Design a protein around this motif. Structure first.
Motif, PDB file in Angstrom:
ATOM      1  N   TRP B  14       0.917  -1.054   0.035  1.00  0.00           N
ATOM      2  CA  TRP B  14      -0.185   0.081   0.043  1.00  0.00           C
ATOM      3  C   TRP B  14       0.890   1.170   0.105  1.00  0.00           C
ATOM      4  O   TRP B  14       0.525   2.152  -0.571  1.00  0.00           O
ATOM      5  N   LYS B  16       3.424   1.350  -1.770  1.00  0.00           N
ATOM      6  CA  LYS B  16       3.980   1.619  -3.317  1.00  0.00           C
ATOM      7  C   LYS B  16       2.549   2.414  -3.794  1.00  0.00           C
ATOM      8  O   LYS B  16       2.641   3.284  -4.804  1.00  0.00           O
ATOM      9  N   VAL B  17       1.290   1.715  -3.514  1.00  0.00           N
ATOM     10  CA  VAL B  17       0.086   2.342  -4.170  1.00  0.00           C
ATOM     11  C   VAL B  17       0.217   3.960  -3.854  1.00  0.00           C
ATOM     12  O   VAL B  17      -0.205   4.748  -4.727  1.00  0.00           O
ATOM     13  N   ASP B  20       1.849   6.536  -6.058  1.00  0.00           N
ATOM     14  CA  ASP B  20       1.228   6.907  -7.491  1.00  0.00           C
ATOM     15  C   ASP B  20      -0.117   6.602  -7.038  1.00  0.00           C
ATOM     16  O   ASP B  20      -0.646   5.757  -8.095  1.00  0.00           O
TER      17      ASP B  20
END
Ligand code: HEM
Ligand code: HEM
Lengths: 153, 153
Positions: B14, B16-17, B20
């Motif tokens: 999450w 990494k989510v 971006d």
């Protein structure tokens, strides 16, 4: 589940517990052990506590009361915090948007697909398994609120 | 329930989510709407979008994907926090202490009595009802974990 109102009444009295956690914990355990003596049999480390007087005198029974109410307070607060974010989403998706559980399954599958596509190196089989279980648990949490709201998802 | 490492894998991806979120939200909604066109019919704002290209150019679809992944991330993080405190308690009380659900009901009764005795001004009938409901939900969450462990509480 509890409304924001009911959680507020719970968190308000818990503030009073936290002002003297050890005193509250001792009183809870002695109430439990005097009302239901079979519960004291589960505590091997309290085998020496044979009377209410001996219970009141015990340093370690008071310390354990603190351990119990500290753990419970944390779980109540973390449950309320989760409810405060889940409940409004279940409310709108049941009542306004009318989103079936089947469609929540489709978006869960789309999230897994996009994470695998964008993070193949990282989001491996184990991490994909973890996210699959987390989104299933999320859908089950929504489904339980749906059933409460009388919305057939 | 996720293992401790499994929740950490969900929280890690999450992160990494969130680096971006607009791109992730676009790609999730495009995957949902292209894989399952029946889902696009729920969005009166988007239902005219025919192609991945048109969906990708829609500022409204990009805005919405960010709202969805923001709401889901917050619910996952609050669930992880609750599980981190609930799971070890259920594990020890099932596998080491062997505590029946009835004994958790006995201690719930003791807590409600001690709070009523000590804090009548903050623990009237409505606040007592709220605490009764909160401790019953806590017991049900433990019972759910007992069932996963094959412990008959
Ligand atoms: C609100 C309910 C309860 C909470 C929050 C609670 C919490 C805790 C915590 C935090 C511990 C220490 C860590 C662990 O082993 O998990 C513990 C230990 C224990 N609990 Fe509970 N508990 C609860 C109810 C009960 C009841 C009703 C019984 C028995 C009738 C019980 C029996 C035990 C025993 C035997 C231990 C180990 C004590 C020792 O020798 O150190 N628990 N509990
Ligand atoms: C992970 C799953 C989902 C999350 C976290 C989520 C989150 C949200 C949020 C935060 C909103 C705006 C506030 C609100 O109305 O509650 C919203 C609106 C909406 N959602 Fe969801 N949603 C999800 C799944 C779905 C699915 C699968 C559909 C349809 C197939 C859907 C249809 C809608 C619609 C129609 C709106 C109103 C859009 C508008 O009028 O602007 N949702 N969603």
């Amino acid at each position: 589940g509890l409304s924001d109102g009911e959680w507020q009444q719970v968190l308000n009295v818990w503030g009073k517990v936290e002002a003297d956690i050890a005193g509250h914990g001792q009183e809870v355990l002695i109430r439990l052990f005097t009302g239901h003596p079979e519960t004291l049999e589960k505590f091997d480390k309290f085998k020496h506590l044979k009377t209410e007087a001996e219970m009141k005198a015990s340093e370690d029974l008071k310390k354990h009361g603190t351990v119990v109410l500290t753990a419970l307070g944390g779980i109540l607060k973390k449950k309320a915090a989760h409810e405060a974010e889940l409940k409004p989403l279940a409310q709108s998706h049941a009542t306004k948007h009318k989103i079936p559980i089947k469609y929540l399954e489709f978006i869960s599958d789309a999230i897994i697909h996009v994470l695998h596509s964008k993070h193949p190196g990282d989001f491996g089989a184990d991490a994909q398994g973890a996210m699959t279980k987390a989104l299933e648990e999320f859908r089950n949490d929504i489904a339980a609120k749906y059933k409460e709201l009388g919305f057939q998802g």
